Amino acid sequence: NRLKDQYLKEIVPALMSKFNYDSVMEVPKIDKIVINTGVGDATANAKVLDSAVEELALITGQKPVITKAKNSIAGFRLREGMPIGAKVTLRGERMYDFLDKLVTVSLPRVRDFRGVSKKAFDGRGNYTLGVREQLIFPEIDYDQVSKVRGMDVVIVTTAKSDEESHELLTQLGMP
Amino acid sequence: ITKIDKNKVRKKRHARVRSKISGTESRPRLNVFRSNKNIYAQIIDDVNGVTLASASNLDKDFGSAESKVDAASKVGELVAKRASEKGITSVTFDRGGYLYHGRVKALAEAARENGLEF
Amino acid sequence: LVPKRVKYRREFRGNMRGRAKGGTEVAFGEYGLQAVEASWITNRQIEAARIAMTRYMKRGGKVWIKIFPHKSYTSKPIGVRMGKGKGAPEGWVSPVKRGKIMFEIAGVPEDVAREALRLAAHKLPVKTKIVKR
């Protein structure tokens, strides 16, 4: 619990002495992380999920759920009910471990890593990026990846605004 | 995030329950309310709305601390007593929107054990 | 004028009883043409009246056509008996009731306006009068 220890040790006091909260429970936390592939190629081949699911479970440490289409679309040649991509929800020890691994190891492995966009905020106080290419993570080899695809990483927060969210993520080590 | 209200979703379930259960003098409803510290419970008829009998893990009597589950059993036994006193023999169980798994099932089966019939 | 898309092609004739539901009070323009009696008014009549008003105003002013020909009518051809179905649609009409302001003008003086509305009314099967804000 490297980063959880770190959190409760340093950042909560620091962050609350900055934003001047009326109590200790107004202080933001990360509720969860949500990883999602977003596969559309699975309309035409079943091997693609067979890759992506195993690959997320290796990247992440728990099985992903294959998400399905809420409605049918002909512009993508997409019938309702088809399996489209998979997702994982990381909470607790494993979201903390995922951020640890992320900033420590994998974010630097990107081609020209000069951080990531600070403007990428939903407006409500949460953050999203996307790993362009899953080989960036160490748990998976490059020699296993038939074809690269990315995945969205949502870092959800109890923060009420972009400022508090950014400071939380800056103290945790997101550039 | 706007987190949930557990009590509100619990009442949404409780309406699924109450669309098929209500209480009458011949056969009241035995409601179970559950909290994290304790359990409350009542026996009431809906035609009138007078809680005929009750019990809880907040009283001055019979207190004990067996991790709240055997306390639930005690509350069951105690409504059974206090209702067989007032003449009640038959009721319909109302799980309050909570599941019939743990503390609630324990309460229920303690009642069924003692002098109370479903 | 026509409606572009219609749900039901064929439609009952209807009534023109009662005063107009609304549109009796000239709102937008300064002057306007009020129907004193009820009648149908066709798209062709509206086009004629509009053009006459606009020519006399010589591309001046702002015109408003309040009415629209929503409803349709049929007519059976000649030499065709009664029955064997309802006829085919021929034309679009507005059932105008009494009190209704069919046309409004802003942007011109009294004389021009009154004379253009006069020129318009003669193209219409309704007895009219002219009325100000």
Partner: protein, 79 residues
């Protein structure tokens, strides 16, 4: 978590082999190595290339300004 469904996930020590930055965190990959870092526990060792401890965006980044391109080359070749 269920039984049987998820893959083997265990606490593993990363080490940046650029500067020997040691760091514990959970993962699912041995890299065929084991150490007993943070005395009282065994941990596999998932060695790695550059980490946050050494990446230029987190550290100095002015490096690799080596040549202007064709110009010093011309002037170096012909004086």
């Amino acid at each position: 978590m269920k039984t049987g469904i998820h893959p083997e996930y265990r606490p593993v020590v990363f080490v940046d082999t650029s500067t020997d930055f040691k760091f514990l965190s959970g993962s699912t990959k041995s890299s065929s190595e084991t150490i007993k870092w943070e005395d009282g526990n065994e941990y596999p060792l998932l060695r790695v290339e550059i980490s946050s401890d050494s990446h230029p965006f987190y550290t100095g980044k002015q490096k690799h300004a080596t040549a202007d391109g064709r110009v010093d080359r011309f002037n170096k070749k012909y004086g």
